[PDB]
Design a protein around this ligand. Structure first.
Ligand SMILES: *Cc1c(C)c(=O)n2c(=O)c(C)c(C)n12
Ligand SMILES: [Cl-]
Ligand SMILES: [Mg+2]
Ligand SMILES: [Mg+2]
Ligand SMILES: [Mg+2]
Ligand SMILES: [Mg+2]
Ligand SMILES: [Mg+2]
Length: 311
């Protein structure tokens, strides 16, 4: 007889179809509906990246594959995955309510973003716990960060090694590795938020494992508020590094992101590519984890370590 546990997998969320762009972005913008020109622009961006339907499917596939893999690799717990999202249904509170309705009394949560922040991870975890407390009779232990899981570092190390090995000799000797995550408001620093330090440590670990001595850290995808967000932005960093040293290849590792969503397919593969094309450099951006077995095994290890069932 196995112990039953909920596996609460949390993420930003994505629209499910083009007609969800308005409500998704209204939610991100804290109730401010995008103007018509912006709605049209967003539609065009999603069309440019190959469409919307594949996006939420990745997150669902990650949760599904993680549940099945956890259930196969150990014999003590049977997990059932529930997805809880920030900016579109199913919302975090919906997922917790569904766990409670289904009879779950004990759950472990993980956010599909490897670095802790007060703005995102801590807020998701607190919301999940608050809903559990309101319903009663259900407890959640929450993963806070996992950027330093060795299997996750190794995923990116090996992707970087493959990219550098694929380069012509002249690029391989004159390339720059840019390691990035989603920008957040700079005011997180008032709380001692470790998010920037964790990104810098991811970059150090990945560059070290891959044997890449020239790398830099940047941020991407900042939102639209009056206070400053973490920088430099990858677009500006790329140009600055080019002006300083003349790199002829840029390799983008958006380690803060786990899937082929707009922030990678457009904010790297279009916006950074515009800059590398303008300066005459080659652009590389290795495969995101998505739902691939190597990444799912890394997440399974994160979960079982959090529960103390793996050293
Ligand atoms: C939607 C989204 C993703 C994937 C992410 O990592 N983040 C953030 O950090 C914010 C603030 C938002 C929105 N998102
Ligand atoms: Cl942490
Ligand atoms: Mg339609
Ligand atoms: Mg399966
Ligand atoms: Mg830790
Ligand atoms: Mg942008
Ligand atoms: Mg500003």
């Amino acid at each position: 007889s196995r112990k039953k546990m909920g596996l609460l997998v949390m993420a930003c969320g994505t629209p499910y179809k083009e007609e969800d762009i308005e409500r998704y972005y209204t939610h991100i913008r804290r109730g401010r509906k995008p103007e018509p020109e912006m709605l049209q622009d967003l539609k065009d961006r999603y069309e440019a990246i190959g469409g919307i339907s594949p996006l939420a499917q990745i997150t669902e596939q990650q949760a599904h594959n993680l549940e099945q893999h956890l259930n196969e690799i150990q014999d003590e717990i049977t997990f059932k995955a529930y997805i809880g999202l920030k900016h579109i249904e199913p919302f975090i509170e919906d997922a917790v309510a569904e766990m409670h309705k289904d009879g779950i009394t004990e759950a472990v949560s993980i956010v599909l973003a490897p670095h802790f922040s007060t703005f995102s991870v801590q807020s998701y975890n607190k919301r999940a716990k608050e809903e559990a407390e309101k319903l009663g009779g259900l407890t959640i232990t929450s993963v806070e960060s996992w950027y330093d899981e060795p299997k996750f570092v190794t995923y990116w190390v090996d992707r970087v090694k493959e990219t550098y090995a694929s380069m012509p000799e002249d690029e391989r000797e004159n390339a720059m590795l840019i390691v990035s995550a989603h920008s957040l408001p700079e005011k997180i620093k008032e709380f001692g938020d470790p998010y920037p330090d964790q990104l810098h440590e991811s970059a150090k670990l990945i560059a070290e494992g891959a044997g890449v001595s020239e790398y830099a850290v940047g941020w991407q995808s900042e939102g639209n508020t009056p206070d400053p967000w973490l920088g430099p932005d990858v677009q500006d960093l790329t140009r600055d590094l080019f002006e300083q040293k003349g790199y002829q290849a840029f390799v983008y590792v958006p380690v803060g992101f786990v899937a082929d969503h707009l922030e990678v397919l457009y904010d790297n593969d279009y916006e950074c590519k515009v800059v590398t094309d303008d300066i005459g450099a080659s652009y590389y951006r290795p495969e995101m984890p998505n739902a691939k077995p190597e990444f799912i095994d890394a997440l399974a290890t994160v979960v079982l370590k959090k529960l103390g069932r793996v050293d």
